[PDB]
């Protein structure tokens, strides 16, 4: 009945968001099971000489799963768009269960987690804390690499190796004379970057 | 390192997956659906669909909603991916939005009040009616019913800039 | 677009657009009467011929 | 040198300035390298207007 709130068109409100039911208290505890996701990432771009390098490392094995307390439902299929073309990214229906039964391995699954976001991806601020409350939007992400079998399990020796990213130093000749000579091997594969560019 | 450069969009995206697929869920429920094979515990998810119209991507032949309207045999089941771009707003700058389903629903909105205005109140004149038709289908009735409805809190309508307004989880 | 007018109608009663009633039910909506006293369904065709 | 004017905008500032505007260009960059904007706020005293 009342017109006077007919002027003002152009008005908003804020509202308090929530997460989804699966990501509340979806923190993984010690002694239950928990579920992990594996996120594939399929190339959807033609390989080429431009395109080689991430069409053959996102077809590795060596993906990385979401870990929850509570099951995820069927997700659709999504579309990304990289700079090299598009990408298809599907999360397997049949979750990984597995157990933790020690509390510092807890610990360092949320280390790795939290490091990715922290040096990775370098999402992280000054306040951001490493959150165990087990509450609103609450979950890991952990590496995985090949088993026995077809079975994938966790990829312990990276977590417990990558708690922090190493910082670029760089090594003068006095310090390199005694250093081991560079092989191939340790080479192939990973990631490197020039401390002196 | 290259798979988890893509992990922020994908964990966005999921976000609001896991909320589209509450919404099919609730609305299947709700019309007594959710027992349909297609609806059931055996619903494979379609995958997303690019909507490449937007700008940063003799005989008749019968219409498809009546006619799924009339038979059921043609009834579709309702795409997780439709939800998730139902809440999806133009604000936030992903690759489908809400507009398209928009302009259907709200000429379907209209078409319902006024039949239901029309059924109910049969004996006034058409001022009176165009009004109240007016009030119903208004900006305001809809986002208080919609409020109660507690669906505005998950909704996709920011752009994503996960370094600078974005909480990992 | 997935379910038809008739399965789309029940959604105004869960968004409580139209209130619903014993008499006439949401999904009926395609049965519209042009009721009233403003017919008179007695009136011999020729009149209106 | 290259083509890339990017780089070529940086290389030539480094080397057309003396070691106090390049240590001082080098310690802007490694103190925020990639921080929020929100987050950084300093103030630069240098004596002439």
């Given at each position: ?197 | ?110 078409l319902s009040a006024t039949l239901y205005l029309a059924s109910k109140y049969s004996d006034w004149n058409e001022?009176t009616l165009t009004?109240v038709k ?36 | ?17 139209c209130r619903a009633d014993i008499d006439k039910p949401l999904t009926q909506l395609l049965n519209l009467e042009l009721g009233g006293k403003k017919m008179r369904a007695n009136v011999?065709?020729?009149?209106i011929? | ?49």
């Amino acid at each position: 009945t009342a017109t006077v709130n007919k002027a003002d068109k152009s008005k908003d409100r804020t509202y308090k968001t929530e997460c989804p039911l699966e990501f509340y208290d979806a923190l993984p505890r010690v002694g239950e099971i928990c579920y992990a996701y594996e996120i594939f990432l399929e190339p959807q771009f033609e390989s080429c000489e431009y395109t080689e390098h991430m069409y053959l490392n996102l077809q590795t094995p060596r993906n990385y799963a979401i870990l929850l307390r509570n099951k995820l439902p069927r997700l659709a299929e999504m579309p990304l768009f990289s700079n090299q073309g598009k990408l298809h990214v599907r999360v397997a229906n049949a979750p990984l269960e597995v157990i933790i039964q020690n509390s510092e391995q807890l610990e360092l699954l949320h280390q790795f987690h939290g490091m990715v976001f922290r040096d990775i991806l370098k999402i992280w601020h000054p306040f951001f804390v490493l959150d165990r409350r087990s509450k609103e939007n609450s979950y890991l992400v952990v590496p995985l690499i090949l088993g026995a079998g077809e079975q994938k399990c966790f990829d312990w020796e990276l977590m417990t190796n990558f708690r922090r990213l190493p910082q670029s130093h760089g090594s003068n000749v006095q310090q390199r004379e005694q250093q081991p000579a560079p092989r191939p091997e340790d080479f192939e594969g990973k990631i490197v970057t020039q401390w002196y560019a | 390192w290259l798979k988890l450069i893509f992990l922020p969009s994908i964990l966005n995206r999921m976000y609001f997956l896991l909320h589209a697929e509450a919404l099919r869920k609730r609305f299947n429920t709700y019309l007594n659906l959710h027992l349909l094979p297609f609806n059931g515990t055996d619903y494979m998810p379609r995958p997303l669909e690019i909507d490449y119209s937007l700008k940063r991507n003799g005989k008749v032949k019968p219409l498809l909603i009546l006619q799924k309207t009339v038979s059921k045999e043609h009834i579709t089941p309702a795409e997780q991916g439709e939800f998730l771009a139902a809440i999806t707003a133009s604000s936030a700058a992903d690759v489908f939005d809400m507009e398209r389903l928009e302009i259907l629903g709200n000429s379907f909105l209209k078409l319902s009040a006024t039949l239901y205005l029309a059924s109910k109140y049969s004996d006034w004149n058409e001022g009176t009616l165009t009004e109240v038709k007016s009030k119903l289908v208004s900006n305001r009735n809809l986002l208080f019913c919609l409020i109660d409805a507690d669906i505005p809190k998950t909704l996709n309508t920011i752009q994503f800039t996960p370094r600078y307004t974005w909480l990992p989880p | 677009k997935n379910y038809g007018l008739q399965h789309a109608f029940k959604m105004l009663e869960y968004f409580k657009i139209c209130r619903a009633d014993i008499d006439k039910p949401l999904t009926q909506l395609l049965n519209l009467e042009l009721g009233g006293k403003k017919m008179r369904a007695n009136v011999n065709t020729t009149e209106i011929d | 040198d290259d083509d890339d004017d990017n780089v070529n905008t940086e290389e030539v500032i480094m080397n057309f300035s003396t070691p106090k505007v390049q240590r001082f260009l080098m310690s802007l960059k490694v103190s925020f390298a990639d921080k929020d904007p929100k987050d950084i706020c300093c103030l630069v005293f240098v004596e002439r207007r």
